[PDB]
Structures are given as C-alpha cells and as structure tokens.
Amino acid sequence: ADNYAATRYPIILVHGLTGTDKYAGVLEYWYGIQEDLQQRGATVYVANLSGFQSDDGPNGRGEQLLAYVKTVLAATGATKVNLVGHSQGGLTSRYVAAVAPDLVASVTTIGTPHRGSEFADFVQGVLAYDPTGLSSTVIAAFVNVFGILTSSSNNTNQDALAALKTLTTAQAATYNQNYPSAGLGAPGSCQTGAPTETVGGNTHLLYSWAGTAIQPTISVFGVTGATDTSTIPLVDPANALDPSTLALFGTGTVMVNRGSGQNDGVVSKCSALYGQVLSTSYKWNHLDEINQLLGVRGANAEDPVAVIRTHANRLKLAGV
Numbered sequence: 001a002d003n004y005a006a007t008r009y010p011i012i013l014v015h016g017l018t019g020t021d022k023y024a025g026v027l028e029y030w031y032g033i034q035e036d037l038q039q040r041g042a043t044v045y046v047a048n049l050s051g052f053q054s055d056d057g058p059n060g061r062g063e064q065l066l067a068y069v070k071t072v073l074a075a076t077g078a079t080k081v082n083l084v085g086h087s088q089g090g091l092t093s094r095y096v097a098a099v100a101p102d103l104v105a106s107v108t109t110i111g112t113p114h115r116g117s118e119f120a121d122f123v124q125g126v127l128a129y130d131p132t133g134l135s136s137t138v139i140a141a142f143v144n145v146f147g148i149l150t151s152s153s154n155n156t157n158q159d160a161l162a163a164l165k166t167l168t169t170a171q172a173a174t175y176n177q178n179y180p181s182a183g184l185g186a187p188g189s190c191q192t193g194a195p196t197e198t199v200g201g202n203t204h205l206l207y208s209w210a211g212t213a214i215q216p217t218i219s220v221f222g223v224t225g226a227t228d229t230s231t232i233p234l235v236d237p238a239n240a241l242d243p244s245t246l247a248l249f250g251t252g253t254v255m256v257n258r259g260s261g262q263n264d265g266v267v268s269k270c271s272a273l274y275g276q277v278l279s280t281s282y283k284w285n286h287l288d289e290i291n292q293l294l295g296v297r298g299a300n301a302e303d304p305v306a307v308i309r310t311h312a313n314r315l316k317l318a319g320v
C-alpha cells in the first residue's frame, strides 16, 4: 500500500441504471475498485441509489446522492467530495454538482450518456408498438421487482419506465437544458466543453472517458455490421466467461444501425463527451468500464482498475 491515489477530498463512486452498491448484497457494482483505491491511500465511499429512477425530481437519484454526499462529509469531516459516476451515475453527479456546487470538487463520468442512448430510444420504441400499452405495465412491474430484489437495501423506490425515458436522447437533451454545464459542448456537435466550471463561486474539475470496443466495420444494403475490438476474434475467452461481452456486442450492433457510431454497447462516443476527455479509445464495452463481470475483459481491453487508479492520482496531483 501507498498513497498513489490519496486525494484531498473523499471519492464517491456512483453506479448507473440497474445498479446498487452491492448486487443482492453480494456482487459489488464497482468490482474490486473500492478495495484497490483504498489500498492506494484513498478514502472511498460507494453510493447506493435507486437502480431505476430519473435523476431529477423529488424521488430521483439526484436528491438521493445529495443526501448521501452530506452523510459522507459529516462522517469524514471533509468539506467536499470527488464524484465519479459510471453511466447514468454521471448524470446524477452532474445534478449534485449543479444544485450543491459548494460540496463538489470534481466530476468524472465513465461511459455516461450525456446525450442519451440510442439503445434507450430503441427499447422505448419497442414498448410503443403494443397498441394496448399493457406490455409497459407488465414489463415495468417485472423490472421494478428486479430493482427491489437486487438492491442491497431492497430499496422499493424503483421506476423502470421513468428510468428508461430519462436515458432516451430526446429526454437527455431536455435534461441538459435544465442542468447546463460548462463541460458540455453544443448538442449535435459531438464535442466536449470546458475542462473546469465555476458555479456559484465554486470551481469543479471536469473529466470523462468512454469505451469504444464496438466499432462499425462494414456497411451493406443499408445494414451496418460491427466488430468487438475488445476481443481476439472468435477465440477470446471473455466471450465464454463473461455473458455481457457478446450481449453488449449485440446491443452495440443495434446502436450503430441507429446512427450511434462507435460505442460500448449502451453509450456512444459522442454521447459520452464531457469536460476534459482523457480518452475515448479504450477497447471496452459498457461493463468492462467497471471491471465487470467479475473482472473479465477481452484480450485487447485495457485494465479498468489501473485506469481508475491512475485517475485518482491525477485528481491528487490536480489538488482535489
């Protein structure tokens, strides 16, 4: 152990949709990451928010995170925290940074759909094809139960329908209007914004990176085929030991056929851009970003634990 990742302010990891700090109280969302960071001298806390909800609103993940941030500060005696969110977690972090700027020192998003997800649009579109609308109710009930059951604390505040809408591209654009950020570029520009922001007199260091394992590699008869660049073609063990590898390749293919361009199976490169874009070259699918499942990744995928560890050091050197 050492203090390679010893940051001034406590680090809080923020999970995305379907998440919880510890699935069924057994499998941790940020697989092996909290242990690694702490071994390197960092003070880390893992948020436990609704796996299914919008980010804003009375019952949203945003207010949940705000309240959690406050308990972390009170317990540590620190005055600010570094927010590190994955997927939707990044949106929840942006919410706290905006409404409570004085409590945040930095915001880092990993594969966060700042502009929404083409796969979210897809899934929502699928539900709309049921003229009776009953599938929304039935499927929502099923997902909500999954949320309650997998939540480490069996949080009953789950709203799959609101979570799905929150992640669509049209809704994401609206979210960015209500919660503007200097770290965001112009919509439809596929560009990032500034590396830092000053809200209400409080400066925040902004960072981000994305996984682009799923690449468009061939187009024929209007159809676009992709390639999972995270794996060694065909024989990669990650395809057998991690069920999400191929699943994400499948969802990633649906996205490129919806005009997403390179992605990680859930979030496009353009949608993930925020603050200082450290990288968008990682050959990662959406779950490799959080060292999942159970630390399995394709042969060509960079080590997610090391990347996050190095960032903690980056934050340290930056003064936060």
Ligand SMILES: *[P@](C)(=O)O[C@H](CC)COc1ccccc1
Pocket (backbone or CB within 6 Å): 015, 016, 017, 018, 019, 086, 087, 088, 089, 113, 117, 119, 120, 123, 164, 167, 266
């Ligand atoms: P981010 C968007 O929170 O990703 C989740 C896995 C961590 C799942 O996101 C979705 C959203 C809609 C349809 C499929 C997956």
Ligand SMILES: [Ca+2]
Pocket (backbone or CB within 6 Å): 242, 244, 245, 287, 288, 291, 292, 293, 295, 296, 297, 298
């Ligand atoms: Ca994986």
